[PDB]
Structures are given as C-alpha cells and as structure tokens.
Design a protein around this ligand. Structure first.
Ligand code: I7P
Ligand code: ANP
Ligand code: MG
Ligand code: MG
Ligand code: MG
Ligand code: MG
Ligand code: MG
Length: 325
C-alpha cells in the first residue's frame, strides 16, 4: 500500500499557496499519498474519527487545537515531522530563549519580567528615563520589550534621549505598515515581558527557513523597527533581499532544527557586531514565492518519509544527495 502523509493544520495554512505548491510536489513521489485533514474535522470531530496516516505533518497556529493533535499522535503513533509537544513551548518566548541558551546559541542579553495581574506594581522593575532595571539587571536605551506570548506581536523598542526618546511600536503587518512611532517613553505597565538589548544591524533582519537540519534557505527584509513602512514590489509582495548563510549560521540552523525538533522551522537572525544572534524561533514556516524552495522542500520531505518508512512497507530506497541551500 501507499505511504500516507497526513497534513493537520488550520485551513488558512493548509490551503495557503506555499502549502499547495509543496503538497503537489510531494504527491509526485510514487509511493506517497497526501491526505489534508479538513478544518471542520480537526475542530469538530473526535480524534478517533480523523483520517489515518503513517507520517504526520501538523503544526499550531492561531485557533488550532494542539491538545487534539497530541492525542491523535498518541492514538495512532505516526512518524511525526514537527514534534507536537515542543509546539507548546514555541508559544512562550521565555521557553524559546531558555532552549537557545542551553544549546550555546548566541542571543541578545535579556531579562524576564513576570507580573502577577493582581499585584502589578510588586514586580522587579525600576524605570529611569534612559534605562530600565529588571531583576536588578540594567538595560540602557535602546532596548526591546517583547510580550512573553510568542503569538503577541506587539513588540516595542524604546529610544534613548540622545535620539529623541519615544518608542517604536511593532505589530502584524496591516497593509503598508509594520510599525509606528509613539512619543511614549515609559514602558508598558501591565503584562509580562522580556526585556533585551537592542542589536545594531544594517537595518535588515535575516529570516531562515529550515527543512531538516542540513538545509536552510535564508532571505533578508527591511527591519520593521526602522520606520515601519513596508517595501512592496510592483507585484504587491514584500521586498526580500538575497542572503547566503556563513558556516556559523548554517550551524545555528542545524542546532535550532534539532533542539526544537521541528523539521520545518523558521527563525530570525540579527547580523550585528560581526556575529549572528537568534531573536525569534517560529516553528513551522514555508518560504513564499520561491519555486526552487518549493522543489527542494518537497524533495527533502519526501526523502525523509521514504528514509524512515520504506523498509516497513518493503519499498526499495537508496538515500539520495540533497542541497544545503
Ligand atoms: O510563518 P507563517 O507562514 O505562519 O506566516 C506568518 C508570518 O511569517 P513569520 O512567522 O516568519 O513572521 C507572515 O509574515 P511574512 O513572512 O509573510 O512577511 C505573516 O504574513 P503577513 O503579515 O500577512 O505578511 P504579508 O503577506 O502582508 O506581506 C503571517 O500573517 P497572516 O497570514 O496575516 O496570519 C503569519 O501568520 P500568523 O503568525 O498566523 O499571523
Ligand atoms: N534584540 C533586538 N535587537 C534589534 N532588533 C530586534 C531585537 N529583537 C527583535 N528585533 C526586531 O523586531 C522585530 C520583531 O521581533 P520578533 O522577536 O521577531 O517578534 P515576533 O513578534 O515574534 N515577529 P514574527 O517573526 O512575525 O514571529 C524583529 O524582526 C527585529 O527586526
Ligand atoms: Mg504519489
Ligand atoms: Mg506560527
Ligand atoms: Mg497578514
Ligand atoms: Mg520574528
Ligand atoms: Mg515570532
């Protein structure tokens, strides 16, 4: 029989252009059949009624019942491409930075301010006009303030008096803007946050997209922190700049993919002071608008499935060579 690869995520993701392009290419594998779980089934049917698969590609996004995906995987024991329990930890920026540190990965200097929503002023924060002290640790402006929830994209940057003060407020893109300037110089007074050193870059972020530990595509984009105007092409897509990862960065990608157990994994690098710092790990993420990535991603994933499962199914398989980029 065919090896069945099940795709389990919200319809917004499962029906996205990149997903559709990659799935049509995985389907080209002679012994692989792809089954995409319907969103109504995922949300409304008990896991005992979900389709069977031998290999499961499943990932959390807004609205996804991760509890059910975990229960399905426990019930059916498929080969899991992106580990489901790690996807709880990826939702918490504190847990992400904790894992990165354990792996010897360079990250910005940071401190966590945990607030009790009933006792909001009893926390360990002291504010001056050009710095904050968080659990005794001093962060001079500029510094970055991130909600402890990785799904909350309201990241603020605070400017020093020498630069005119105020703050830059970042958010999920709304049309032509990714951030806005605020005259507010004081930090947020409710909620829990990570405070971290601002890393000076050339004004771009590097986005890295892994497909297993030995393949990573990278590209750069204008930092939303810069002025907040999105650069769009005549075709309406955000402008992306070419990047080739150096040896240190290729190792970072290997470590991130393995430490979070996410075969398909997006993360962000800040190229600053002659080194590269990880500032965000997002988990499952596909490159958009690269045909070569579609081809490579589908081949690599298909090959992983065949490597793992072909012996079980008595299918002959000789392990092929793959690009690292
Ligand atoms: O990783 P993914 O594939 O899940 O997508 C992420 C994010 O990628 P990231 O995690 O590496 O930052 C995308 O940013 P990009 O890389 O395309 O610039 C963003 O697209 P966007 O803001 O619409 O960008 P535009 O199309 O307006 O240019 C998208 O927002 P939504 O589609 O509106 O939900 C996000 O989904 P979610 O996190 O659920 O909000
Ligand atoms: N420590 C830092 N130093 C300099 N820039 C930073 C720093 N931390 C975050 N940034 C910038 O702020 C942007 C958003 O922060 P990030 O941690 O990526 O938030 P996010 O909400 O998880 N964004 P997303 O990539 O959509 O998941 C980054 O892309 C950088 O441009
Ligand atoms: Mg097929
Ligand atoms: Mg995500
Ligand atoms: Mg959007
Ligand atoms: Mg990011
Ligand atoms: Mg993120």
């Amino acid at each position: 029989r065919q090896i069945v690869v099940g795709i389990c995520s919200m319809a917004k993701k499962s029906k996205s252009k990149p997903m559709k392009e990659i799935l049509e290419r995985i389907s080209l594998f002679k012994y692989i059949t792809v089954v995409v779980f319907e969103e109504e089934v995922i949300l409304n049917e008990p896991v005992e009624n979900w389709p069977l698969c031998d290999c499961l590609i499943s990932f959390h996004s807004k609205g996804f019942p991760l509890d059910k995906a975990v229960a399905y995987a426990k019930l059916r024991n498929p080969f899991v491409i992106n580990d489901l329990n790690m996807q709880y930890l990826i939702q918490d920026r504190r847990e992400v930075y904790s894992i990165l540190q354990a792996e010897g990965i360079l990250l910005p200097r940071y401190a966590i301010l945990n607030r009790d929503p009933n006792n909001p002023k009893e926390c360990n924060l002291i504010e001056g006009e050009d710095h904050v002290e968080v659990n005794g640790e001093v962060f001079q402006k500029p510094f970055v303030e991130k909600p402890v929830s990785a799904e909350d994209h309201n990241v603020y940057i605070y400017y020093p008096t020498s630069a005119g003060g105020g703050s830059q407020r970042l958010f999920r893109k709304i049309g032509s803007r990714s951030s806005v300037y605020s005259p507010e110089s004081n930090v947020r007074k409710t909620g829990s946050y990570i405070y971290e050193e601002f890393m000076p870059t050339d004004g771009t972020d590097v986005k890295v997209y892994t497909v297993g530990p030995d393949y990573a595509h990278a590209e750069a984009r204008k930092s939303p922190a810069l002025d907040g105007k999105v650069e769009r092409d005549s075709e309406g897509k955000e402008v992306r700049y070419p990047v080739i990862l150096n040896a240190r960065e290729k190792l970072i990608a290997w470590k991130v993919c393995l430490a979070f157990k996410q075969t398909v994994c997006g993360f962000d690098l800040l190229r600053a002071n002659g080194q590269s710092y990880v500032c965000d790990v997002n988990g499952f993420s596909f490159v958009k608008n690269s045909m070569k990535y579609y081809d490579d991603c589908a081949k690599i994933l298909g090959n992983i499935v065949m490597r793992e499962l072909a012996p079980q199914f008595h299918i002959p398989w000789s392990i092929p060579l793959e690009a690292e980029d």
